[PDB]
Subunit: 222 residues, 8 copies
Amino acid sequence: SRHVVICGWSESTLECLRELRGSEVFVLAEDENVRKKVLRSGANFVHGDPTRVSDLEKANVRGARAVIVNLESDSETIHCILGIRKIDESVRIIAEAERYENIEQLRMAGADQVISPFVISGRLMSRSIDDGYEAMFVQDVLAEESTRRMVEVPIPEGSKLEGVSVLDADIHDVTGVIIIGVGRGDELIIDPPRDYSFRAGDIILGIGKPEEIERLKNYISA
Amino acid sequence: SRHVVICGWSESTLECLRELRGSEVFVLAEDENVRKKVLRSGANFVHGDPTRVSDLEKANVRGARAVIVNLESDSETIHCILGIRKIDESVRIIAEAERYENIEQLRMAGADQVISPFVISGRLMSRSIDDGYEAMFVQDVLAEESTRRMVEVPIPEGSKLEGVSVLDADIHDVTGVIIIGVGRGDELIIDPPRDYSFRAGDIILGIGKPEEIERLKNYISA
Amino acid sequence: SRHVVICGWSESTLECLRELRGSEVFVLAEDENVRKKVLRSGANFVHGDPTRVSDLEKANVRGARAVIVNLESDSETIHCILGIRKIDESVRIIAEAERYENIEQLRMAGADQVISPFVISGRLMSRSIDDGYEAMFVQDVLAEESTRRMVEVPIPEGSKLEGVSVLDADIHDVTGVIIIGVGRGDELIIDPPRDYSFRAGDIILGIGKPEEIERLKNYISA
Amino acid sequence: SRHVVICGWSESTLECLRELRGSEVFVLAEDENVRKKVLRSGANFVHGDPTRVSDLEKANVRGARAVIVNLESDSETIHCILGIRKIDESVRIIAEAERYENIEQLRMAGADQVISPFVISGRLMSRSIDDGYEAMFVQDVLAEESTRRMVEVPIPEGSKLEGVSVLDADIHDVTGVIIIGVGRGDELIIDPPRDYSFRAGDIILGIGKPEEIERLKNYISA
Amino acid sequence: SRHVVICGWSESTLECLRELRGSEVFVLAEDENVRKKVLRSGANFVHGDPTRVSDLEKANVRGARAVIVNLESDSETIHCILGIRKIDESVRIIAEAERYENIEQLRMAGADQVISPFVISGRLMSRSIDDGYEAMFVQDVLAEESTRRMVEVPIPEGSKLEGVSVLDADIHDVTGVIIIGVGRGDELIIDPPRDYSFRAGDIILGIGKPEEIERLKNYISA
Amino acid sequence: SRHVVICGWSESTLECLRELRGSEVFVLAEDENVRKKVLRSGANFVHGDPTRVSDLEKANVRGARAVIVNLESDSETIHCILGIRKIDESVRIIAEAERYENIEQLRMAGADQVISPFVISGRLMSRSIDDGYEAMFVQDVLAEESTRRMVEVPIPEGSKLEGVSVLDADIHDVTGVIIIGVGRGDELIIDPPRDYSFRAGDIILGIGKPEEIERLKNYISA
Amino acid sequence: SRHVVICGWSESTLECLRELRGSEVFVLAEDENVRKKVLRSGANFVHGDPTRVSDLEKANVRGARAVIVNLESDSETIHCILGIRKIDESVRIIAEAERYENIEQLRMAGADQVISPFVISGRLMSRSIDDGYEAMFVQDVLAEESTRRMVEVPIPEGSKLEGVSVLDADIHDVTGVIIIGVGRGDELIIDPPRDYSFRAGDIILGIGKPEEIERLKNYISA
Amino acid sequence: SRHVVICGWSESTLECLRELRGSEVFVLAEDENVRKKVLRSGANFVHGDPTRVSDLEKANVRGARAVIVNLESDSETIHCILGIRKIDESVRIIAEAERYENIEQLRMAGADQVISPFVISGRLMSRSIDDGYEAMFVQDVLAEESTRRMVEVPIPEGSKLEGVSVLDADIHDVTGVIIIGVGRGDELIIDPPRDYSFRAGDIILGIGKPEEIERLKNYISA
């Protein structure tokens, strides 16, 4: 079915729910004081040790749409992932890493996608000591979306750009949206060549103003 | 004004310490156990309460190059920042936010740069449930830097691009680097207008491969 | 629109509850142990995080008669105040400060009235090493009310003192009550000049025996 | 010998020390963690149990100028006082109470002055739900001294007012200071009658501005 | 009525219940984990702070047959007693002291009877280092009653010994029971003179075998 | 064999230390914080686990004069005793019991003398609900020694009572001291038979006033 | 009379529960958190103190089939065993020891079978520094049973091997199973002499593949 | 270089050290409290986080003879192992597992030998509910060695049994030792066939008495 399991619970998992559908969601956590918070956010709760194979099963890891792992240490996170893989070799796994050196480990454990927020943060700290416009960008487009947002956008099964090359698409100058890359199953091509051409299903990874995104959305189908 | 003060301690601030000279660095924290780790990474350690004005003072917040604030809760981060502002009204302050709602408040308290690692981490989760091209872009360029990298590159007091427009300079088509924004004295102009004109001192924010970046360094110099 | 919200729970807020109706009081606190204490004091209890905006919203901060903030540290107190302001710019906020240096900060955050019991206590301690008449005054009119009280008394919509000079009114002679100040429109003129003229809505701040206070209430009326 | 012993440690006693000498003060507390705080404030530390009679002896309670008692509970405070009286029946004891019901008890145990910060606080909170002119006066006279200040001023061995009645002295009109009482050896007479005549070593308790207070001192001189 | 209140809870209060009637008994304690234990032992439980006057009232201290105090520190025990006295000047109070130096304190607080088990123990330890028959006696007559017990026995309103002197009673040699003392309201006379004479109501404090106690019981009435 | 080992620490063992030379004394305990108190009372402190044979060994349990065992639970007391018996089969062991049911077990583990302070304390409570003559006897002679006292008095290698019977010696009627028992080599004969005959070395256990005891010392000597 | 009692809860006792019926198992533990873990393993839960005799009584220790004792320290384990013996002299006790030195002590207390997993583990660790065939044998027949198992197999009331010599029986040749020992009446003869004769009720202790074990069961029968 | 690193500390690793040298052993643990224990056992202590790659480096994992991993959770153990393999891909790693499901996982992470004390334990508990001959054998051969012992014995560079079949060697009848397998470089052949012929450096795994073992060594010599 369409359900999602979340292991552990923190401010990032709380944020993750703002964007998700509560019925859909099962939070698996060791500590009970988390139950009220999880329920208030409109998700289901499961009391269990998320490093225990039988408890991961209990929380419906098997048919799940995706599993999100964020435990209190990299040690527990890895271990959770090892567990999940024993239950389902092919379920999509998203996992938060703490220490840079364990990004690798989570990936050889089974994480399909890793996130290192404490490493991004730690580096934006050092680059920003004198000014750091990089930090401004991250904060104002990834975090707050105060003027511009980054977006994944599908070329529909309609047309307009079907078969058309990026050079002939001239998206930046037609839309106002910068293209960062094109996603086609399992690989993101960043800065795609003039000659690379589009098909229905491809995801465009862009940056633009809300009105610019509306132009882009319009100019891809019909 | 060459020393940097860090308030509190975590993997963020550890990563922070990695890429800047730990000899200019003073870490101020309540917890004794943190001392060992801090000295081990080549910084000095001041034992004190970062919410206490007299403790901020004694840790040389005064004419410091920058103060990095990352405490165990937003409450204490905010308080700490208010404390630093009574000591020095103009010192550069960088600060980590946990909760979205408290970004605004760190800013109002007097933070020059806010970082939101959990807000970012949480968006990337819910965005990554099926695809997560956005997430792999962020992982691979802001965290791991496996192929491409994000750079703030200064236009040197030297020559080539002074006066020349973003349209005329054609930076991407010349150099390979996708240009995301130009930064000038506190502001970042993202996707600048064609007729924008480069001045010396400007910071170019862009994404490229290390040798694409190299070509950009040259192109832009005297 | 007359319910009161109290954030946090201490002997202070217990005492505050003596003089309040109790059914119309809502105490918001993180710690579940507070529930029985609150219910025994005859007030209502909301379990939530008073630093979290949405929890403040749910405790009915908006358009409450007043909010009393007394958290476990000044950091949390300040933070809670910032939260309340976000929900309601105008609601009356009364707040307890621990450290002298945070008195100003609570005000900047938005507190309409700050109270510094430990600063008061500490000054009385140093001043009382040898004799401390000052201490026993405070103790016996602000705390125990053993013989005298301090009161705020409004000049009724009625008359008698309308237009009348403070010299001409002879309030201390007629009434026994030492006038300390007159308050109007949130300015407290302490020890007003002889020529200061009374009007309706003015609040007399005085010290008196309970009989002297009856007396002040008849003198001021009709 | 005029050294001062303080039992326990808190923002209260921190503020106390502000006005005291420091090289003359001995803080007695059970917690080793308090030591750094007490030294950083210019006082001497004694590691002991302030409820233990022999530890109290070790802290030189015997000949002391005064002992200030402020422990973590009324229980402990009461106990510590009982301890002191067993060692010295006539040493000056100043002690902070938390709960109201225990004021009498600190007294019975032997406290010469009791102080109720939380009771004062809770009072001012509930009285401030609308206007708070009272609270305003307290903050700005006992705590902040932003405008006026309280004062004890002895009637010197000397002259001017010896045998002069309060009516004749006319202190408010000469000085601008509001008399609130006369301390007459353990006695505080509040709002003294007009035919009360000042004698040797009476202590006047007043409220006034810095220059009003300076004027009082001259007017009462030799 | 006939109810008894117990403050605090320990192995000695558990033992005390072996001999008491459960309905009769109210245990007042701060900590909930004690509730199941108290209920299992057949007593009633009250959740409350036994140093709080209002909670002592809540637990029915007022009309109680007796109140037994055994808190975790002498500080809390004394304080409890001070509280109880404010509620009922004449209720019988039995209290456990920890430190020898506080035996006095509990008594001037209001305890009608004090028990110092840690002092008795500590001394029997030192006296028993080489042999200590004293310890054997305490342990085998006060604790285990393995062969002999110590007993309080009332001379009934019957007769036999009514008016008779202890010399003429020859109790030791008639009964086998050693007399340690005679209790008559408020005072125990130890080693009563040959001439002292008996009346109905007097309690005999003895030591004997079960059969010896039976002879004594017999030989006092009818 | 002149040193004494104490296992664990409490007010019991503090009282114990009071009346014997702290220079012969080694205290063994898990808790670091206990060190300060122990040195302060003139004993040495060994930091170790009293349930661990190698730790008992290293604390000189071997040929010690006696070992006093008072640990935080009966479980550990019992274990500790078993541990000491593997090291020395015949060293004198004195031990504190908390629970009645565990007296038997400390004994079976190998304790020469058991002490039950809570069992005793608990009996005295329920016995003291109305009268408590028993309790005041125990308080006043085993704890406080306000008038009478309990004494173990040795019959010296000297003279007077050798061979003489308890009937002939008439100790009480001669001396004032109530005689409770005679102790001979591991046993205590309480209320000995008339024809019992005193031998040198016997210990008389009795209750008297200090000068009644003095008369007994003389009467019994050479 | 076939219920089993388990004192304490650990991965050990979880594992033990695999091979037991579960409905007939009662786990006694102090910590309420254990309840959910037990109920998930399909066993019943009693909340009590397994060191307290009356709690053991209430968990039905008396006449249970066996009691398994696995507490958090050897002290508690020993103590619990002593408790059980007091209730039932004959019930089978199986116990887990942590420290080598306590193996003997658990037996003295009354354990019918002791198990030392950490002693076993520690020996295998030191012995395995270089190659450890011994380790992989243990791992693969005592733990994982990946290829072979160890079994106890009874000589049926039937016959075939009745009276037959172990040399004459050729068990290893016929059956594939290495015989290690024969047990009768709680003596285990390991590696019996050639001339040792089998009888009914004897238990063969062997190592074999599951097919070799089927084989042993037919050979031994009929 | 043949120093041994141990990660973590417990009764396991204490027993390990029993048979190891000690001046060659380095224990790596996070807890400062472990230091005293590790020194009192003749080993060296390193204060570090055994899950931190750089701390592992600091402990000289690089060239080590072997590393023993035994942390407080399987999570940590797995993580520590992943750490070691990143530093050294071929160093001998021996690791203790708690839960069964994690045996494979320690292996996948890189453990050369895994040990399951709790799984072994739980097995022997449930199999011992009636007879426990199995458990008896384990205790008295792997732990206590009260009677027999296990052994690995290499077939020396020398002679006697080179190319000799197990049938011809007839080891049980010559020696009295039960052969259980032959180790042949990473291979453990259990119950080897009769026409298996011993070659160079094979390791025989057997059970026997001290003198049976001594006989095996002679019989297999040069």
